[PDB]
Every structure is written in structure tokens, then in C-alpha cells.
Amino acid sequence: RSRSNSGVRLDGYARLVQQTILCHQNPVTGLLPASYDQKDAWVRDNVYSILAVWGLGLAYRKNADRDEDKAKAYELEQSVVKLMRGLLHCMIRQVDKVESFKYSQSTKDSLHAKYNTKTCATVVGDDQWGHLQLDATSVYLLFLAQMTASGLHIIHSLDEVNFIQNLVFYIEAAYKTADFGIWERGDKTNQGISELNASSVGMAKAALEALDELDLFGVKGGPQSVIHVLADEVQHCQSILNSLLPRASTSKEVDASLLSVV
């Protein structure tokens, strides 16, 4: 008759997520600014920062037998959809960069790490920031595959299916592409030198495996909505991970971001 104690304690977690994370979600774009000083949304941070909302929504959905705890489950689930869709629009507004990066894996043609949290536009230019972060698109691609597998309908059109498919080729060459990485500074020196970080190589391998024969439309999908991943690039990332580890790169003996890979 009354709500289960799990629902009651999730309210304290709902307050914690709302007061800390979900109160900063942009009304229009669904994106999350890093802070009040840094009013922009990072692709990697936004994906990571939405996990609490996604976990809470899954936690609330476990007991969805009443109108209210169905609705807060719906809010948390669709707030995650809003952010992942909002982050999709940021990258889909840079399809020219995705197309160019597939053939020429250059930093000048990489998806921007930070976007306008209010309009899903590029705040900074292609050279004003360390933009090539293959572990930021991969953290999006991995969780996009995982959130669809959990039932969250993020991809809405077959054109976005093509975009995500083209994003696979964007992160395919992570084993052979140097990038600034999880810390947006490249090598240990912090001198604009991109390096092969195990975080980017590892993240792409997981994202590629996550997207491997994945129906972006969920169960109510078809072969048109399936992302096809080639295990050549997946296991090539392994050959690099085995060789790199326990090091994060040739310049780093270790990085704590490898916890995001191992």
C-alpha cells in the first residue's frame, strides 16, 4: 500500500542528484555545465555526470507500480535521454569534422570537447582548445549502446543511426591515433603534443564492443538500425592495451584514468 523503503531511500538519493546534478541541466539542451566558472558542457563530463541520473532512473524503475515513482523514473530516464540526445546534437552539428576525421585522423578535424550548454554550439574554435579526445566520444558511444540496451530510446532517426555508425569509424583508429585524452593536455609535458593514451584506446575498444551488432532502436528495431563493428579494430585496440599497460602512455608510467579502462 505504501512505498517500499527502497523508494523512500531513493528520495534522499533523488534529492542528492537533483540538488547536485539535475538542477544544472540546461532546460533547452539537457546539457550540464562543468561549474559556474566554467559554463560549458564537456562531452566526457556530461556522459559521466549523467550516470547517477541513469542509475537512479533504473533504481526507481525497479518498483514502478505507482504514478509518482513511475514519473520520477520517467524524469530521470528521459533526463538521461535529454543529455545524450543533447550531446548527440552537439556532435551532429559537427558532422563535417566526423567525416574529415575518419579519413585524416588529425586534431584539427576532431569533435569539440566542449560545447555551448545553452545552444549545443561550439563555444571555442578548432585550435583554441585541445579537442581530440577519443575517450570522450567513446564514453558517449559506450553508454549510448548501454543505455539503449537498458531500454532508453536515444537514437530517433536512421540518419542518426548513420551518424553513430560514422562515429564508430571516428573512434575506430584510436589504437593508431594520438589524442589529448581524458585530461585534455596530451603528453605529461602539457605542450600541445597528442599521445597514444591507453584511456582513449581502451575506451574505444569498449565502445566498439558495446556497439557491436547493437540495435539503436532497441528491441523494436531492424537491420537498418544496427551498428556494425569490425573486430579487427576492436582487437587492434587490445594489442595496444596489452603493450601499453600498466603504463597509460609512453610519457606516463601510470594514470588513474586507467581505472576507467581496466
Next chain:
Amino acid sequence: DNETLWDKLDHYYRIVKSTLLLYQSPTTGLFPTKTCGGDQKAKIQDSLYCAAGAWALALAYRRIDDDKGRTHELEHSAIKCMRGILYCYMRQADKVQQFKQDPRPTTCLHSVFNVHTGDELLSYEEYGHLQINAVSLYLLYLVEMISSGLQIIYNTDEVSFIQNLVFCVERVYRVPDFGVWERGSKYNNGSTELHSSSVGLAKAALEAINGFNLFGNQGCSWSVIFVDLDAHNRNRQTLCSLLPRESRSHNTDAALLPCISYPAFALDDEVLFSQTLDKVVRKLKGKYGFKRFLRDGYRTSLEDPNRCYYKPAEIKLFDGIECEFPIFFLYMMIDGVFRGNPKQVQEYQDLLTPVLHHTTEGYPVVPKYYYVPADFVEYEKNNPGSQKRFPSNCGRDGKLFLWGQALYIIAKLLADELISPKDIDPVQRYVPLKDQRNVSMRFSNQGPLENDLVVHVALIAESQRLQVFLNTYGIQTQTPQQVEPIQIWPQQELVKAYLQLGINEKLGLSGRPDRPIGCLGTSKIYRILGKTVVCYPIIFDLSDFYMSQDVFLLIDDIKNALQFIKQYWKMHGRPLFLVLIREDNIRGSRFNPILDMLAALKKGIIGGVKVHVDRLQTLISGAVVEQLDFLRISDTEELPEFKSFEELEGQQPDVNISEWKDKPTHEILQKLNDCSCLASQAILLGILLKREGPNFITKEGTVSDHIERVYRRAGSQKLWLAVRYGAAFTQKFSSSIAPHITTFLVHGKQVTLGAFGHEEEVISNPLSPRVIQNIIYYKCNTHDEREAVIQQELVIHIGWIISNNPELFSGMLKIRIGWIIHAMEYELQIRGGDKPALDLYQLSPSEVKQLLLDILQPQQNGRCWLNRRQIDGSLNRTPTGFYDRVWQILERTPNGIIVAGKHLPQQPTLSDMTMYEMNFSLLVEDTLGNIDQPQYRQIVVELLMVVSIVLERNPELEFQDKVDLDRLVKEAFNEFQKDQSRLKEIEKQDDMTSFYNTPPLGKRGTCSYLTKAVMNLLLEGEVKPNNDDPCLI
């Protein structure tokens, strides 16, 4: 036909994927207007219908279990478009906040967006963005897709924005807009004008979205959208008044089908529906499509593409060559499927097939419009509908009309019965003749034709001393303390409670605007913060104005409020009408009128409205309670308890206005102490606020509040002079005047607010309370401040009559206030005899209404005919259809009409407008305006009637020269003298009196001499041999 349903749906899938879904923006989800050309324009109206087309095919594919992922692709193609409009709209949340507070063409939501970014594309100067059809259709379709199962709204933050969109739609009844055709009218002046389609779509949007959970099945009490019934009701009153006309300029428009049929179905009265359908079918249907409106020059051969606005004379060249839009064959096709008429579906299908074009792959292309070429314009004008038209969009060119292509999918899927009418109408916008039990949609429990609504009337006395003392006269009442856990509120406290609804500090949205809640809103039972609150009607508020203090008007306000609720309450529960009685209503002779009304309520019937008098606890037990949950979801459980109603525990002015105003000495302050009358005080305090600053100190206190005390205190005595000065010198303005004016002009009636012989301001278009407040006090009247108070007195009074007795002002096209206040002030002179007559500012507001009603009567009984022509003339009352007869006159006078130095020519008058048109009716009074004597006006208005009698029944005669009616009035004049001089030789010369007193119909009446005057000049012309009755000789 052994085809499997997969192959039938695959047929439309290819069309949908290649003709409209191929162009959906990956970023914003919007559909560009121009498929080829690189244009960034994405119209909300067009994008909304494109979302419906993918949604419609998704509903069809819902019948295929092995959909191969096409249901998800088409369902979420609609969601992608629906959320993109939301993305564009929420990026303009600062404009939504502005449009809520002050609806204006320069503060509205944009209707055109960049298809690739969602940015603002065109400014208010380049494009007319005020298109309520876009916002209303968005709200309507948002309800439709969410009801069908499409999840568009993702969080309460979006729910707050949708609530603010509803607020922007509530006020639309007073907001002129550019309409669907982003043009406003035929004249293309860039002038916003009230459209039936836009207001009707707002009515459709408000009905579907009221109490609608934006989360769908995954929803709770904090996602339901609240809709103000009364702003919806005033939106419907506008729609019913404007119809069967689209607007002031348009007698009919093709936009009516989207309004009165799919997707809106905004008309709930089957008589009007039919009337409005035929004018579209008759005056706009064509072989190649439907014409948007008569004399529509959009994309015509006679249109200058560079110019964005049409000349006043350019609309003439647009007759017969209007572009025909095939999209409305589809709209009629959807109408046929919805309404169960298969002949209509087949008939309009047989018309689309010739006009349909096809791509290289055979996919149907619906052209946007079919235009007559420049080589064939003049043949078309002579014989309309006989010359070939070329398609705007043909396919194979790259240019596709996505709105037409999307609407093709919806109609064909319905025609082949692949989607049911209820599938695209999950919230039932179309209801069959089984029209019962739909909230907000005129279908109460009784149905569409019976309206014996019972209103729950709760008798509330302000104090126990009133409670027991009324009880001693057989009336049972309860003080608020007697109804204790329940809270009786002023309607303002409900507005203060409603201020928290829809607030988003993240979007900068401030909640529901501070606007009074009317009778229907206060008729609801509210539960706020765990307290059940019932608000008494605003008619019992003693703050807005002082005619609520007049007991007779309050009695009539109580009566007409009940009739207003009887007519416009269409919810599940029975309305609650709390009657508040104050001690001022009982004290004095005001008991006898108040007691009979209360006895009638106790008897069970008042004003013909069935009422139920019972305790408030009885009338609250099982009624539906409006849960103001937004006041608790924000955790404002400690919000200040809104102040509920608290129980309470003789000569004519000896000082003339000119006597002391002319007096230069300032000793009048001592004269204030010297005199003892309230009116003398009410004038002395007024100059003190002007002569000695706004907030000077007096014996009682500050000037500002001392006049307020006098105004409050003067009303208690019912010394009406002081209460009229008291309200005038404080610039008092009740909230009802501005909506009352808007009610006037939506009935076709221009309003002028100013005293006789001074500056009068014509209210052509609906105006906000702010400007009308500036209008009624600052610019209009400055000779006397009490002119505004008397000006506002009638506006409510005419607002009272225009609804109860609409026929009473028939012919009176211009309600001119000061001209009307002349009619009462001149009537007082007439009734005053050779005695000092009554002053219009001495009469109680009841006598102001009664005398106004007396001087309005269809035919004053038995009065001097001179005086009748004075009462009708002063009101500018014209016969029914009088303005029409002026056409038949002007149609047959080549050189026109000249009267009092004002000339009405045959051209360009006949060429510019139509003879049901409102503009011509305004033109006559402008030509008729120079006649100073109201009695002289009527004899001319009489003459224009009789010459119309001569012209209609005698088509052979036609005037040669200009018809100078003053001469005809003068010519028929002397014949009256020489006839009456032969009778008794009246020595009065150039006196209209004898000529005015004689009745028209009689032995020697006015129209007899007027008839002779016409024929003498009418027989001065060549007769035309007529073939209708070939002359036997």
C-alpha cells in the same frame, strides 16, 4: 486486391521516407520549407504537419508486428520534430515570458527558425512572427502524439515551459495575429488582425491540453497542464462571434478547414459548422484546389515579388486569379473520413488525382498552389475556373511542399482505412453527434442542445449581525467562520496562488500573469496546500469599481453571472456560485431589491437559471477539486496563508463647477471647511492633488488616501456625485472595461471613448488594459475627469447588454460612448421638462443602466417623432442591413453620393470591397459623419433607406448626377412647408420641427415627401429598358 498490408504500408513508406522524412533536419528535427535552394527556413506550422505525417504512418505501422523497425523510426521522427520545436521555443523563453505579460507582434514567439541550428532567422520587421496557429497547433499535436504514446516531454522543466505556452495562448482572444498565412489580411499592410483559425486553434489547444499529463502513462500530478477556463471561454466567445467569418477582412478562408476540421475541430455547434463549411465550399473551392481567401494575391502573376506589402488598390486586381491550394482537398478528404461521409472522401479524391504530380519514382507530389499564368489572367477573370493552371511544385524539380506531402499521407491512410480517425485523434477533437460529457468542449452531461444547468449557490453573509438579521427575513446564510475549514477567498488570492504555476527560474519564467479569475474559474472548487478554497465571483469585489456597490447592478450582476455560468460551464461537476452579502447591501432601501433576489435563489430559479441554495459543505462534498499541486511540488508548504475572507466582528450641489473654478483666490481651502457637502469635498480634494501636489498632507492625512477614504465613504451613503468624482480623480479603472471593448469589436462594432464634441479615440482593434487606461484618462477626456468615470460606466453597461440583448444594438455599428452619454443626457433634458433636469452624475448606476436601456429600445413608445429621430439619430442607429442597401444605391449611382460635403463615389468604392464587407459599413459613417444634428442624421438615414426602396423595386431608373441628399432632404422639406402652409400657415422658417414630428408612414409622412423628392430627381434621368419585365408598352 490480395496485397499484404506490409506492401500497402511499404508503398507509403517510400513516399514518406523520400518526400518528407528525407529532409528532416538531423540536428533540430525540423522540416525545411524549401527542399531545394539551400534555404534555412523551417516553419513550425509546416514542421508540425510533417511530424503528423510520420506519426500517421507510425500509427499505420503499429498494425504490423514485423514492422522491421519502421514504427520506431516513424514514431521517433515525429518525436524528433516535436522536440525540435520545443528546442526552438525554449531557446526563446525570454520571448514567452514577454508575450505572457504583454502579447504583441514584437514580443511574440518566432514562427520561422533555422532548420539546421534552431536559431532565430527573421526579425519582427522582416517577418510577421505572431502566428498563434503555430503555438496552438504545437500544443494540440503535442497532446495528440503523447496520447498516442509518443514521449516528447522529458522533464518537469519542459512541463513548465508548456504551461507558459498555454498562458501565451490563453490571452489570444484579444491578440490580433498574422494568422497561418503570415499576412494578416488581403491588404498586406502588415497589420495584425484577429483570425478565427488562430483563436479556434487556441480553443482546440486549450481543450486538449487542460489537465493533460505531458508524461503520458509514466506521469503524476506534477506534469498536468492547467488551463484557465475563462480565457478559454473568451477565446471561444471570440471564435463564435467571428465565425462564420475568418476575420474582419475575410468573410471566409481556406484556413477554416484546419480550424473547424482536422486537426483542430474547433467548432462544437453543428449549425455554424455547416454555415462555415459552405462559405469555404462555395466561395473558395476550385478545380485545382482551394483558394486561401478571396482576392488573395500570394504568388499570383499580378504580384510584385520585390514588394512585401500590397497597395490599397492592388487587392482589386486579385479577384478571380487567386492561387488554388490542393492541400484543402486533403483537408476535406480527412474531414470526410472523420465525419463518416464516404461520398465526400471519394469526391475530393477524384479532385486530387488530376492535381497530383509524381516524382521520377512515381511518388505522389502535392503542389503547394496552382496559379493562372500571366498569359491567361484576363481570360480567367471573365470566366473563372475555365483556364488551365500551372503547379507551384511539380516534383522532379527538387522543390517539395512538405506540408502538402505530409497531409497527403494522413488523408490517404485514412481513406484506405490504414489508420482509424481515432488513431490520429487519441484525445477526441472530433466528437460525433453523441456530444456529451467532454470537459471544456461544450458537451456537458446534458449534451449539445439542452442546457438546464443547475448552479450551486452558496449564501454567504459577511458578519453574524448580517447573518442572523437576514435569517430573520427567511434567508439562510453562512458566515465564513460558520463554513470553517473551507476558505472563502477573493479571486485575487487565487491569482496570487496561481503566480507559482509554471515558474522556471532556469528558463526565467514567472508563472501565470496577474489577471483576474472570472466566474467560471471561481465556480471551480480548489484545494490549495491541503485547504479547500472556494473563491466568490469578482462581481462581489468592492475594489475594482463602484457599480458593484450599487445594489441593483449587483443584483443584475448576480443574475447575469448565473446566466453566464449556465451558458458557458461545460465541466463534469456543478459550478459553485458563492453569493456574498455585505451590510451595505442591506442598509437603507436596498433591502427590498436584495431580498427578492435572495428569495428567488431560495425558490430555486433566478433569471431563468436553475440554482440550488444549500450549505457550502453540501455543495462541496462530491465535486471535483482542482488540485493546485504546483504550490507544493516546489516544497512551498510554508507559503504565507493567503488572506481568506474575514468575518466582521441631501440636496443638489450648492457649489457650481464654474463658480469656484473661475474664483482665482486660493481661499477655497477655507471654503472646503465652510461647505458641508460630500461632492464639494470630492471636488476640493481633487484640486488639492493637482494644485498642491500628489501626496500633500490634509487634516485627515495625505491627499492620496483621503480621497480614497472619501470614495469608499461616499459609496456607503450612495451619494453618487462624490463616488463619481472620487473614482475619476484617482484614475480608477476596473479590469472589465478592456475585455468589454474587445467583446464589442469582435461583434463588428467600433468603439469610441470620448465626450461629445471633444477628441474621440476609435478602438478599431483589441487593446491591452494599459493603453486603454492611458486612452480613457490622459488623451481622451481632459475637460472633465468625471467624463472617464461615466465613460467607463457605460462600457460595462453596454457590456451587460451586448450579451443579454445583442439585437438591441443592431444597426448601431459604432458604439460611441460620449455620443451615447449625450443620448442619456439629452433624454434627461427631454424628460426634465421646463424644470431643472436630472444630472447623469446624480443618477445611481442602476438608473444609468435603466435610462440607457430606455433610450435604446427598438422603438420608444409614443414619443415625439422628432424626439425618436433624436434618440435613434444620436445612437447612430441604422436599419437592419442598411449598410447593404447603400451598395445597391452606390451600385446604381455612377457619380456617387455627396452629403454634408462628404462624397461617396461609385469608384474605387465598389472595386475595393465587397457588399457584405465591414470596411464599407465604416465608410458610410465617415461620409455620414459631417451631419451635426442627430435628428438630421436620421432623416438622411431615412432617405438612404427609401431611395434603396425606389432602386430595388424599380431597377429601370438610374441616377445621372451625384446624389446630393441634403438637397433631396431640402427639396422634400419645402413641399412639407407649402403643404402645411396651405393647412395652417406655420410661420416658422427653416425650422425642422414640424417636418421632424410627423411619422414617416401616414397621410402626409416624411418618407412620402422623401419618396417624391427621390422620384422627381430619379425621373430626371434616362430610363433603362429592363429585360426582367419587358415593358408591355
